[PDB]
């Protein structure tokens, strides 16, 4: 939230991005031998509950970035101002 306000650290974010994506593959490949009721689901799930907060704010980013590809590019926007190179005004943006 903090790197995404302000330009100059896109290379942070994605740094950030592909060690998120390091560590979300790392506690992925805890569960490619799991069991309906092993101790290593329980104890993910506990650090889940743990941190619900933050993993609910990264579960939100996403949703909105994800809601974001479709929401554009399907209807409107699209043909709103077709001129070339993406041009826009910021204004019929907002309502967009």
């Known amino acids: 939230m903090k790197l995404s306000q302000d330009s100059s650290q896109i290379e942070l974010l994605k740094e950030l991005m592909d060690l998120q994506k390091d560590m979300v593959v790392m506690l992925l490949s805890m569960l490619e031998g799991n069991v309906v009721n092993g101790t290593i689901g329980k104890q993910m799930v506990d650090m889940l509950v743990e941190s619900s907060n933050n993993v609910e704010m990264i579960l939100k980013f996403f949703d909105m970035f994800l809601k974001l590809?479709?929401?554009?590019?399907?209807?409107?926007?699209?043909?709103?101002?077709?001129?070339?190179k993406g041009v826009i005004s910021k204004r019929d943006f907002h309502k967009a």
């Not at 590809?69 to 070339?84: A, C, I, M, N, V």
């Open 69 to 84: 590809k479709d929401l554009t590019s399907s209807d409107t926007f699209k043909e709103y101002d077709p001129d070339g």
